Amino acid sequence: EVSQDLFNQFNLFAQYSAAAYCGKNNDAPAGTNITCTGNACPEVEKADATFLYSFEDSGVGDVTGFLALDNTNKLIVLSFRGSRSIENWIGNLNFDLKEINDICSGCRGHDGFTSSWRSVADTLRQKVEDAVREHPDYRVVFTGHSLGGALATVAGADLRGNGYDIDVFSYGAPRVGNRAFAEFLTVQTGGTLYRITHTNDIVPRLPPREFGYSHSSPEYWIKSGTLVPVTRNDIVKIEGIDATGGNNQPNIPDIPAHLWYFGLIGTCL
Amino acid sequence: EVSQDLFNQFNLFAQYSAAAYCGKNNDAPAGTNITCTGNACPEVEKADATFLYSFEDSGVGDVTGFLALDNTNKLIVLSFRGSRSIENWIGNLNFDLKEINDICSGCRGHDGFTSSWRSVADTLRQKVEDAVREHPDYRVVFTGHSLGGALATVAGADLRGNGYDIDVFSYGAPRVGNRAFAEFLTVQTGGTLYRITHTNDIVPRLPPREFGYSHSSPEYWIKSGTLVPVTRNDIVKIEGIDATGGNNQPNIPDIPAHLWYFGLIGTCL
């Protein structure tokens, strides 16, 4: 359903996200080769990938991850790690909205996530812009899993419109805000946001639409089960704001589904 | 390089070994269906498999596992769970031997696996003997991953000779005794021992050949990577007590490879 090329990209940024969790990238120097423990990022290792700057618990909230240079795929990748302990992070989900008129009029955004980037924006924006200058032919991609996803999304739509495109690949990211913000992320240019979801993943199910929250369009939904390999014939396109037959299907969710995006993610062997 | 039927058996008892860690199996009432959390044992859930006896922390070595009644596959499965943390078990692993002439004359084995089994020997002997009585035509199969693998092997060797075959399926098991116990396990009658290893797995190389420890023959070696699906073509039969060319290779060991046997094992999502 989704093209081979789009599948490869989905696979690659799933591993860049998984790389944020695993092996020597929680705190590191600059210029290091990107490697992961337990085969967590083979496609990244297979490419000429190198660190540019690595961060941890940055700003008011806890922001951890890396900025990467991919000479093979011609990329500048900002990858945000999710939480140290996910199970705890699930139940503590404050369902409050805060207006975000700076990025778009009438938009409402999750207080916890919106303020998280707002506390680190200038320190990382600088280092991305720096890398853009050195490789202005390189595609700027922001990626993340879970809480790392949420950051990448808020970091994206925010830092867009400064002459360079920002693609975003989120894996099991939670809802960020209202219907107007759902419609905004859908039609905003200078980057295409790819929100990847899995079966009954507990994260993108929340916050609920009964709290006024919504998801942007489209939604890329992995229907294949946990610990099952994914093929481009198992990713259905769900176009339309909060349409059913996706992570928005009427049933009971799950946590192990959150840890399987193409491969193992949000945990390390 | 193995038959398909043997492949299916390898897969099923890997899922049975996985079950010993994961799900609501830890201590549930008898006759209740065997299930696991995080797609750890689908093939087991597929079968009419219920618990007969549930045990945990029992014995002097905190022996954990379950006795399983499989009406679909017509099996009686005894499954041994490994350590809760394989790291704090690899580090704390004592390599001191002890006499084991109850099983085979001249054999000496690992004092930890022997004493842990010795404590639960009669008790679990009894409950298998009931299931054999309940189902004379059913196949008695002892299985386990990691530590559990070793226990299963020590049990198999011990309880063979009561008028019913006992097949053993161990996954990434450590070496369990000297040269005498290995040969006994290599050519013993009344049940086949299937010793499964994966790539550069750590545990199967412990304890050292240089501490009075040897491996039973044959070996069934999984060549496919960690987090890579296993086919019949990825398993190779290695012939010979302490043979090389399989897992017994002069290279750097790997912990994650121990956590991937046909599917996720030794850990739960």
Q: Which two tokens stand for residue A211?
A: 């709290």
Name the one residue in this structure whose structure tokens are 């049975």: B16
Instruction: Report yes or no: A218 and A242 within 8 Å, Cβ to Cβ.
Output: no
**Tally of structural domains, chain A:** 1
HSE value, Cβ hemisphere, 13 Å, CA-based, for B62: 6
Helix, strand or coil for residue B23? Answer: coil
Catalytic residue of the set B17, B201, B215, B216: B201
**CA distances (Å), origin B164, targets B128, B132, B141, B160:** 10, 8, 10, 7
Whether A39 and chain B come into contact, CB under 8 Å, resolves to yes
Residue of A nearest to B267 (CA): A269
Instruction: Report yes or no: B254 and B202 within 8 Å, Cβ to Cβ.
Output: yes
Strand intervals (E) in A166-257:
166-171, 193-198, 219-222, 235-238
Of A38, A225, A260, the CB nearest to B256: A38
Instruction: Report yes or no: A253 and A220 within 8 Å, Cβ to Cβ.
Output: no
Nearest to A157 by CA among A135, A134, A173: A173
> How far is it, in rounded angstroms, from Cα A226 to Cα A261?
8
Residue B48 bears catalytic tag: no
Q: Provide the 8-state DSSP code for B192.
A: -
> How far is it, in rounded angstroms, from Cα A7 to Cα A1?
10
What Å resolution does this PDB entry report? 2.3
> How far is it, in rounded angstroms, from Cα B76 to Cα B57?
22
Q: How far is B101 from chain A (nearest CA, A)?
A: 39
DSSP-H helix ranges across B135-191: 147-159, 179-187
Interacting residues of A179 by C-beta distance below 8 A, sequence separation 6+: A212, A214, A241
Instruction: Report yes or no: A95 and A141 within 8 Å, Cβ to Cβ.
Output: no
| Distance linking the first and last C-alpha atoms of chain B | 31
Interface contact flag, B226 A259, Cβ < 8 Å: no
Residue B146 bears catalytic tag: yes
Helix, strand or coil for residue A157? Answer: helix
Instruction: Report yes or no: A198 and A175 within 8 Å, Cβ to Cβ.
Output: no
Measured between beta carbons, which residues in chain B are less than 8 angstroms from residue A37? 256
> How far is it, in rounded angstroms, from Cα A149 to Cα A63?
11
Interface contact flag, B39 A269, Cβ < 8 Å: no
Interacting residues of B146 by C-beta distance below 8 A, sequence separation 6+: B82, B83, B86, B89, B171, B172, B173, B174, B203, B258, B266
> How far is it, in rounded angstroms, from Cα A167 to Cα A163?
13
Q: How many CB atoms lie within 10 A of CB A4?
A: 9
Residue B217 bears catalytic tag: no
The enclosing domain of A68 has a CATH number of 3.40.50.1820
Report the length, in residues, of chain B: 269
Q: How far is A268 from chain B (nearest CA, A)?
A: 9
Reduced DSSP (H G I as helix, E B as strand, rest coil) percent helix, strand, coil of chain B, to 5: 30, 25, 45
Interface contact flag, A264 B225, Cβ < 8 Å: no
Q: Which two tokens stand for residue A206?
A: 């929340």
Q: Provide the 8-state DSSP code for B123.
A: H
Interface contact flag, B269 A263, Cβ < 8 Å: no
Catalytic residue of the set A170, A201, A215, A216: A201
Counting one residue from chain A and one from chain B, the pairs whose CB atoms sit within 8 A come to 44
Instruction: Report yes or no: A67 and A131 within 8 Å, Cβ to Cβ.
Output: yes
Report the length, in residues, of chain A: 269
> How far is it, in rounded angstroms, from Cα B173 to Cα B220?
12
Instruction: Report yes or no: A194 and A169 within 8 Å, Cβ to Cβ.
Output: yes
Whether B265 and chain A come into contact, CB under 8 Å, resolves to no
Domain span at B134: 1-269
Instruction: Report yes or no: B199 and B247 within 8 Å, Cβ to Cβ.
Output: yes
Method: X-ray
Strand intervals (E) in chain B:
49-58, 63-70, 75-80, 97-99, 108-110, 139-145, 166-171, 193-198, 219-222, 235-238, 260-261, 263-264
Task: Annotate B18-52 with b (16+ C-beta within 10 A) or e (fewer).
Answer: bbbbbbebbebeeeeebbbbbbbbebbbebebbbb
